[model samples]
Target: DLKLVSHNVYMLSTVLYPNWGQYKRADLIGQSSYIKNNDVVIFNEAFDNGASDKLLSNVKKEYPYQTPVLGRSQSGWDKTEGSYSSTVAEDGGVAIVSKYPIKEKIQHVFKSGCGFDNDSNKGFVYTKIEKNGKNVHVIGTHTQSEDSRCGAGHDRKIRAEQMKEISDFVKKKNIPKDETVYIGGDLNVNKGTPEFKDMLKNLNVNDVLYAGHNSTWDPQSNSIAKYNYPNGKPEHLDYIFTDKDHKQPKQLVNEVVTEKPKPWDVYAAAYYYVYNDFSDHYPIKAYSK
Candidate 1:
């Protein structure tokens, strides 16, 4: 059995725009208690500060292993930052939180998105968990922003490259095709969106969005977000992608945690907010057996 969770908490810019308020570690840590005792978490939007301490501390007991480097921070944001971010805020890198003991952890950094201004900490955090006397490899990542790269089609190119790296790693590692391999996070691309379609053809990864329920947005009716989503567009940019050529998870589950914490008379983690909501996106979860 394998369970996974991924969230993209937009981080405060490291160097480009210092003191840009995004999210606080305390906010993430507080909600991490809800993490399943039998699950592994892959987190995105982990830009700079507190990236390590927040993930490791929240999931220390479950995933005893961790790997954190200057994910796209020092080199100035594309994916090849050789150094760490200079921001006092959380603008470093992404990470994984798990309940299962991790045997290995690997980090892949890119050069295109590697700096204080660049959103390039764009890579995957791979983990190996012992299951049924075999090792299960689960990889997680948040692709580059479509708007950041240039536009919709251009954004697809950035994400396609990231997926290629992930694909190569899975193949090179020889991860079992039948193993419960999962890749998830704030993909920043929707299931049926053109960018998503491009990603599918490029990497051939199976999307799990169809396996679950209607996300915060529905292609049928373009209604105002049910929950207070500031972004007026009703697009489900978050998702989970499973390894292709393998049986997808049996039980797929997704729910919008409406009962979010709000502080200072505003919604959680809003513009220039304090310790409040988990991230800009509500928490999405799933279980597989």
Candidate 2:
């Protein structure tokens, strides 16, 4: 049996901008503990912030194998007492922590990025875990942002290119046909978007989340928007894809994994608490038997 989860932790300064005072690594770390042994957890927008370090330290025993964190840092304003305070912050990047022993870990920064996303590096972290007498290749990434001022849809274009790059990287690795493979992360593009659909075709992997949930991203904090309310418009920006042609050694048991709060939990304290409790992007898990 295999169980895997993909989550955009939102522990970066870029997303949680101007609200450093509200930052809470303890809550994030608590959520990381929700995953148990023999599970694979992929994280995007994960940084070396105090929260991330504390989370790793807390869950080191459950998820023994981890991919090296890759990304850059920048200075951002942290609003404290209705005033802005300059603070150096780290952001962007991806990570994979597995319960199984990792055979290898590889990271690749994409050649192109989009909009404000250009400031930091975005890439894939691929790792291999031996299970059931076969190597299971797990790939994680956080593609370019959908935030674009240029109306030409350049943001989607960059994300498409990044997906191609991920495919090319895996192909070049000469991964054995018998190996089980799973690719997941915050693609930032909705499930039916043209670019995202093309990614599904090019990668030739089944989106396991397709069977369960319709949306994963919800705007709740100042980081996502100036207003802090749960608007009804939710987008499915994250995904977990599995190799179909390779006939992965197990059958997927459809299940929904997310941090969406209950409908009544849309007030100020509740909205703010949700971010600390989890993240803007819901966690997705793929279970197999």
In order of listing, the candidates' clash counts read: 25, 0
TM-score of 1: 0.72
lDDT of 1 at 275: 34
* lDDT tens per residue, model 1, 20-54: 33434434444554455547666666664554455
Q: Candidate 1, overall lDDT?
A: 0.56
What stretches of model 1 exceed 4 Å from their correct place? 13-28, 69-92, 111-119, 149-152, 209-231, 253-259, 262-276
The lowest-lDDT stretch of 10 consecutive residues in candidate 2 is 76-85
Task: Rate residue 165 of model 2 by lDDT.
Answer: 81
Per-prediction TM-score: 0.72, 0.77
Tell me the RMSD of model 2 versus the true structure. Answer: 7.8
Overlapping backbone residue pairs in candidate 2 total: 0
